[PDB]
Design a protein around this nucleic acid. Structure first.
Lengths: 245, 276, 169, 182
RNA sequence: GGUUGCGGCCAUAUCUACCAGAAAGCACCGUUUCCCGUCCGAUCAACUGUAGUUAAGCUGGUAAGAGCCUGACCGAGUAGUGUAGUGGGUGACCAUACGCGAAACUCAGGUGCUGCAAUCU
RNA sequence: GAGAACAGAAAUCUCCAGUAGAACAAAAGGGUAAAAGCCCCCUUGAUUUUGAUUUUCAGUGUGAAUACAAACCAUGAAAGU
């Protein structure tokens, strides 16, 4: 009389909201290494994430019925898919919604340089925790789609925005450094999935107070090519960028 | 005998479910540490009740699957003097002491934590598929961990010696318990009446004739020894992987190749149903 | 080969049905209590049949599950009074049988008509070394397809120890 | 061992989510695919960046708590922790404001008719001829006081009591279905 | 490496029949004061490997076994969807042609790998 | 179904088992299998203290309730719920 009512009042909105939930329903085409791809690449938002079992012959960017249906029905906001073809080979969907509708649909050509976490020496980790991000390049702020993919990761890998924090579970980071300069109207630089850590050491000039941080490369060292991009309404900005008050 | 649609649609349980080695339902209530205050590492406890083994460990949850950092055993007893009872209640309490001492020395405090301070730990327990009750060896081992130097959130309503009608902790019975009261009391209350059961139990202790007083001297000396040294230097592993696999690999079956198995099919088409 | 694999008894469950709830049920049941020691519980009549005298959640089933040396004794009595011979049927596909004795008066006590002296039915359970995988919650596992006693093995066992005979197959 | 890097465009921080953003320029092929020094070079650049991070993110205000074991929405004694500001960015929400506003034809009554909504004191009300406290509604209480006693001194009128109450709560339900349709 | 413990991913992972199970964890299975649990030592629990320990526990092969993954644009640049028109047009419309885009059957390949404390003659 | 002498087509005990059609204040694409599917124990919840909605003729250094947070609350050994 209250189970799917506690669940329902969770599913209901909030003012100072919770974390946002992800959705991974395989398309009509996958591969074993793609099973590996999903696990290793989304391997941090576990728990708060959704996976599926079967496949779909689907077109995401034309109509927006089916995955909207699935997401409304599973209470989530972060749709993902891996769409494959001969021409649009490896043109995956990393799309965020807004209010069970969709804000902007993003498809990245996922490059063929798949370097998994087992591609290097295994390490430890504190699972699920909230990561750090670094973003180098003025294109991360002057290139609209670089801004889009930036904020996409910034709201997917964001985690629970909680004031209190402790150095201990503050270990891991993404390194974002775009593949060089650009100009508008030409072939584009690509993004680098660069999962690294921050390891503490005396600076001999920072010493006890200021450490010296060293990162270790373990993977999964992946790359991202841009794909097909949407550009939603400005009323979307009116509803999306405000305050509860 | 199952059909085609049945077994071409149906679903499997989990692999670690196929065995009695994980209660994922509580693993999902633990992987949620709270989990909404803020980030702070996991310190969990794993106990398994196996014959001849006292398996008590402390894991780190990782994407590489797990890295159990802390571990306890039974074979490091001769250095503490008492060696028998690799399972019993004295064993539970003793290893609860010993894990405390080793993890103490491996933090390296007694005689990164950024500028403040020592920060003593709080290690919990994920119950596993052993049920939780009172009056047993599990919570005696918990007492051992506590009085060694762990700090576990719990109540004493579980400590053997706990009264649940009039909520009474019996410090006298617990003291007798600790110095060898219930076990050696069973020994003598069986021995004043019969020797066959008395002999069946304490298979060497019957031959060394150690009375409760002397095994409580063992208790004391071993307590002070645990507090002294968490040394725990393991086996040298004589006859390494090569010779271990000489044993474990001299009588193992390997794959029968496609040419051989197709020749077995050739047998099937020549003599079996190929008209004798 | 039989190094250790035998067919020891696990438990003897009685199966008594009543077409009424009252002093009759409780009379045969107090008889059960003096017989066993563990008070014969009440189990619900599943739901009404209306032809047999039963309704829903009535608590009309009373079964006792006997173990321990008392079990060997009650089986020796409950075959001796059966003349060490039972009927053709009741051999379970598991290696057991459920058979009944008319008028339990036939052994021991006197009648006392006003306490409950009726006909009863037993159902035995066996076991094989290796079959304790069901009982232990942990190590939840399987058994061999041939390592489990069946109808052939319960005919074998009705021939085997306790030296029982079958009354025309 | 160093602490200060050179940023020809000095970097920015956004700490509610533990982030830093640089607006410096990169040569086209400095980070390209065909590099076998891709690891060393890009990892050294972001190494300088995260050096900047950890030199920045340590002299902040904290929150020491003088309470000991048992801190419900908080900590034990032994630690001292670091806090987070709000990031200078508005990340995507999930909904509009979870609003619920209406009139339900009763709110207009509360306003125009000078009716202050009641104070909801409690439930266990005192019923004479009993000698006890029994709730206005909650244990066969002051609600059900006619389907209990033995004679009423006025077709049984008890069933009539119950059916009248059913008509009442149904009128409640009709005027609630209206309010939830509007 | 056997595996003890935890797993990561959840049928290559299970079910169907053997054989091997040579070391040690691994189990089967004997006892019952006090802690104890219920209708019961059925489960827990006081004892060691105790009495029985390879028959299940358990891995493997053994079997084109049943069921499941990958690839052959293999179908397939398929149909088709908006992209040129007084092309086609009495009508249920198909084209050239460009964005994109097959799917299944099909033809074969395979029926579990990693990490940390541990014991091996 | 194999079983199942009083008792059988529907009275009580095992087994293979239906991966469920487990049973859901359902309707779901789905979906919990040590379960939301039964019963055995435990208890009060309409607590109070503070910012936003307003708001009273002693327009009550916030009195009224709404939402949110804590503080306590019951449970459990326990992190938890």
């Amino acid at each position: 009389n209250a189970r799917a009512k506690r669940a329902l009042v969770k599913r209901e909105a909030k003012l100072v909201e919770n974390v946002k939930q992800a959705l991974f329903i395989p398309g009509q085409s996958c591969n074993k290494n793609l099973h590996d791809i999903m696990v290793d690449l989304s391997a941090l938002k576990k728990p708060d994430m959704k996976r599926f079992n079967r496949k779909n012959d689907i077109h995401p960017f034309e109509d927006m019925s089916p995955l909207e249906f699935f997401s409304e029905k599973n209470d989530c906001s972060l749709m993902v898919l891996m769409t494959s073809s001969k021409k649009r080979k490896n043109n995956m969907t990393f799309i965020r919604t807004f209010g069970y509708k969709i804000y902007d649909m993003i498809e990245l050509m996922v490059a063929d340089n798949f370097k998994l976490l087992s591609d290097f020496k295994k390490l430890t980790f504190t699972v699920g925790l909230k990561p750090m991000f670094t973003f180098q390049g003025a294109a991360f702020d002057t290139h609209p789609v670089y801004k889009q993919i930036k904020s996409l990761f910034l709201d997917f890998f964001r985690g629970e925005s909680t004031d209190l924090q402790d150095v201990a579970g503050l270990q891991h980071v993404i390194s974002m450094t775009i593949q060089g300069d650009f100009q508008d109207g030409e072939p584009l630089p690509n993004v680098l999935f660069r999962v690294y850590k921050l390891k503490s050491y005396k600076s001999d000039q920072g010493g006890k107070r200021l450490p010296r941080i060293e990162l270790v490369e373990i993977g999964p060292r992946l790359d991202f090519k841009i794909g097909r991009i949407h550009t939603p309404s400005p009323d979307m900005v009116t509803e999306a960028h405000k305050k509860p008050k | 005998a199952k059909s085609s649609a049945y077994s071409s649609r149906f679903q499997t349980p989990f692999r670690r479910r196929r065995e009695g080695k994980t209660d994922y339902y509580q693993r999902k209530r633990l992987v949620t540490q709270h989990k909404a205050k803020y980030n702070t590492p996991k310190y969990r406890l794993v106990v398994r009740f196996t014959n001849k083994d006292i398996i008590c460990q402390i894991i780190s949850s990782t994407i590489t699957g797990d890295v159990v950092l802390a571990a306890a055993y039974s074979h490091e007893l001769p250095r503490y003097g008492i060696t028998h009872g690799l399972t019993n209640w004295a064993a539970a309490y003793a290893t609860g002491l010993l894990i405390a001492r080793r993890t103490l020395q491996k933090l390296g405090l007694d005689e990164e934590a950024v500028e403040d301070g020592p920060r003593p730990f709080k290690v919990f327990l994920d119950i596993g598929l052993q049920r939780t009750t009172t009056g047993a060896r599990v919570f005696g081992a918990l007492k051992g961990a506590s009085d060694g130097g762990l700090y576990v959130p719990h109540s004493e309503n579980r400590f053997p010696g706990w009264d649940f009608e009039t909520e009474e902790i019996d410090p006298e019975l617990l003291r007798s318990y600790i110095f060898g009261g219930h076990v050696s009391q069973y020994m003598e209350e069986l021995a004043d009446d019969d020797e066959e059961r008395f002999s069946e139990l304490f298979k060497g202790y019957l031959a060394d004739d150690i009375d409760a007083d002397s095994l409580e001297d063992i208790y004391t000396s071993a307590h002070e020894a645990i507090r002294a040294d968490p040394a725990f230097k393991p086996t040298e592993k004589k006859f390494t992987k090569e010779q271990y696999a000489a044993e474990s690999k001299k009588y193992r079956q390997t794959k029968l190749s496609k040419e051989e198995r197709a020749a077995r099919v050739a047998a099937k088409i020549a003599a079996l149903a190929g008209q004798q | 080969q039989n190094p250790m694999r035998d067919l020891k008894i696990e438990k003897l469950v009685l199966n008594i049905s009543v077409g009424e709830s009252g002093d009759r049920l409780t009379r045969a049941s107090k008889v059960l209590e003096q017989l066993s020691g563990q008070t014969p519980v009440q189990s619900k009549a599943r739901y009404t049949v209306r032809t047999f005298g039963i309704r829903r959640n009535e608590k009309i089933a009373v079964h006792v599950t006997v173990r321990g040396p008392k079990a060997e004794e009650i089986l020796e009595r409950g075959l001796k009074v059966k003349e060490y011979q039972l009927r053709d049927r009741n051999f379970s596909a598991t290696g057991n049988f459920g058979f009944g004795i008319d008028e339990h008066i036939d052994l021991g006590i006197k009648y006392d008509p006003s306490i409950g002296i009726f006909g009863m039915d037993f159902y035995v359970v066996m076991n094989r070394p290796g079959a304790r995988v069901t009982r232990r919650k942990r190590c939840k596992g399987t058994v061999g397809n041939s390592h489990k006693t069946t109808k052939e093995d319960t005919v074998s066992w009705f021939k085997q120890k306790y030296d029982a005979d079958v009354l025309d197959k | 061992l160093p602490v200060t890097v050179e940023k020809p465009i000095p970097v920015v921080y956004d700490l509610g989510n533990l982030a830093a953003f640089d607006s410096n320029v990169l040569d086209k092929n400095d980070l390209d695919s065909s590099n076998a020094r891709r690891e060393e070079k890009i990892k050294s650049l972001t190494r300088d960046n995260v050096q900047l991070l950890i030199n920045q993110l340590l002299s902040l205000p904290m929150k020491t708590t003088t309470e000991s074991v048992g801190g419900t929405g908080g900590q034990s004694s032994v630690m001292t922790l670091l806090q987070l500001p709000d990031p200078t960015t508005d990340l995507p929400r999930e909904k509009p404001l979870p609003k619920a506003k209406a009139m339900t034809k009763w709110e207009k009554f509360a306003a125009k008719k000078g009716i202050k909504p009641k104070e909801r004191a409690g439930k266990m009300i005192y019923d004479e001829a009993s000698g006890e406290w029994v709730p206005k509604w909650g244990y066969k209480g002051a609600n059900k006081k006619l389907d209990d006693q033995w004679l009423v001194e006025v077709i049984d009128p008890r069933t009539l009591n119950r059916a009248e109450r059913k008509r009442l709560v149904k009128k409640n339900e009709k005027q609630q279905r209206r309010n939830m349709k509007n």
